[model samples]
Target chain A: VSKETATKTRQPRVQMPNGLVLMRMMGILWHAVAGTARNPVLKAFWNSVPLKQATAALRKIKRTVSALMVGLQKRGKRR
Target chain B: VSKETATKTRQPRVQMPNGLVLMRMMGILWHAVAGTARNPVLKAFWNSVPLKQATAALRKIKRTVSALMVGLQKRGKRR
Candidate 1:
């Protein structure tokens, strides 16, 4: 992460067709777990949110990622 | 549904540059929560595992996903 995070240039910058929900969610979660962020203000907020390794909160994030996939189908019908 | 599961058609088919780790992990976890899979063998295995909507298993998958991202930097160094 030396000066720049994997988010900007180091890691894959692909988005899920404007991949807001999961990307942003994962981005937020990504920074929290990584202990790095583009901004410090929210970083403090994210720091407060205990990632706590393998706890229920972290588990909820996984389920939340899965659940976000559910909305894809419902969105397809409207298209 | 409507002929194909979201994995085959409706969902985004992205791989994290040989994203075997997270892709497969998320794929496996994705099915466990979604109750669908491409095959029958592991389908049963995934089925047996409980998703339980906001349980430890799902959380593990999420944290695991976060942890897997750590490997990206190492892999980048070798590239």
Candidate 2:
């Protein structure tokens, strides 16, 4: 392990919400490994796309699931 | 149809953070339907344990994963 990254900062590390963290980590991974990501515009686009956009999109699914759960909860409560 | 839960209040609905929301909803469902959950102490214990417990547990795994990813990112950047 490189000592540079061995130095962990509590501040920047835990700031990301669940899904946004995944997105940014994914961005860094793709930027590292993709063979076909040579296009400057594409790289910029990928980098520029807010992590929250991905997170919010995933949150939509959570909302849909929550909606179903809410109905189920109310029904369960009624009985 | 009872309107108690249906008349959604945005204030209460979104108030539970992600882990708490899931936990509370699960609590309500379990309270409603579970056959073996009648024990007063068990129900109270289940309800009382803070939802942050679950979220913190999940965040630990996220940290472990982030640690590995950080090393990978630095190596990738170096080469």
Q: Against the true structure, whose DockQ is highest?
A: 1
Per-residue lDDT tens digits of candidate 2, residues B1-79?
Answer: 2233233211232344554344333333332341212444335544665543544554444444345544554564553
> Candidate 1's residue-wise lDDT over A1-79, tens digit each?
2223223321344232322323344444433333332444334433554343324444455566667555443574563
Per-residue accuracy of model 2 over A1-63 as CA lDDT, tens digit each: 333222321113323454544333343332234211244544554465444354444445334
Query: Mind giving the per-residue lDDT tens digits that candidate 1 earns over B1-79?
Result: 4233223321334323322323344444432332332555444433444334324344455566567555443475562
Which CAPRI level is candidate 1? incorrect
After superposition on all CA atoms, how large is the RMSD of candidate 2?
18.8
Task: Name the regions of candidate 2 deviating beyond 4 angstroms.
Answer: A1-79, B1-50, B77-79
TM-score of each: 0.29, 0.22
Candidate RMSDs in order: 14.8, 18.8
